[PDB]
Amino acid sequence: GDVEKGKKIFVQKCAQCHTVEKGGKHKTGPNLHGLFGRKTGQAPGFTYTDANKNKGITWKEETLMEYLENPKKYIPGTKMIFAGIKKKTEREDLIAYLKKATNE
Ligand code: HEC
């Protein structure tokens, strides 16, 4: 996906609750550094819902594509407020950005 378009989506839809830099602060939502290849609910120092904590999936392209379309459907009970991104290409672009930034 397109990293620059993804970064724009992140800034407008995600940065108000999340950081992505290594050891970046928690905000309303957990810091997302190291997300890829890790189970749900594993950001050190963040207090997750049991729902998020116990979803038992690994974050990766496939699971984020589904989740970001409709978070509350994928993790019923989540405390994350976000309707969803309808467009597959927008999801891909965002995920490409996240794959870059959360791995810096
Ligand atoms: C913009 C589209 C995003 C994206 C890419 C993510 N979020 Fe959030 N988020 C918020 C909170 C409170 C949580 C914890 C939910 C809970 O404990 O029930 C989350 C969680 C996530 C995750 C899962 C992290 C994990 O380690 O399992 C992911 C991948 C994620 N978010 C991505 C809070 C917010 C917001 C507050 C109003 C909004 C806006 C966003 N998140 C937006 C996004």
| DSSP letter for each residue of 5-45 | HHHHHHHHHTTTT---STTPPP-SS---TT-TT-BTT--TT
Q: Which domains does the chain have, with CATH numbers?
A: 1-104 (1.10.760.10)
Going by the annotation, the residues of the binding site for heme c are 14, 17-18, 80
Resolution to 1 decimal, in Å? 1.8
Residue 75 Ramachandran class (φ > 0 left, ψ -120 to 50 alpha, else beta):
beta
- Pocket probe mutation, ligand 1, options 46, 55, 80, max atoms within 8 Å of Cβ: 80
Rg, C-alpha atoms of the chain = 12
- For residues 62 and 98, what is the distance between their CA atoms, to the nearest angstrom? 13
Residue 37: CB atoms within 10 Å = 9
Residue whose CA is at the smallest distance from ligand 1 atom 39: 14
Assess whether the C-beta atom of 80 lies below 6 angstroms from ligand 1.
yes
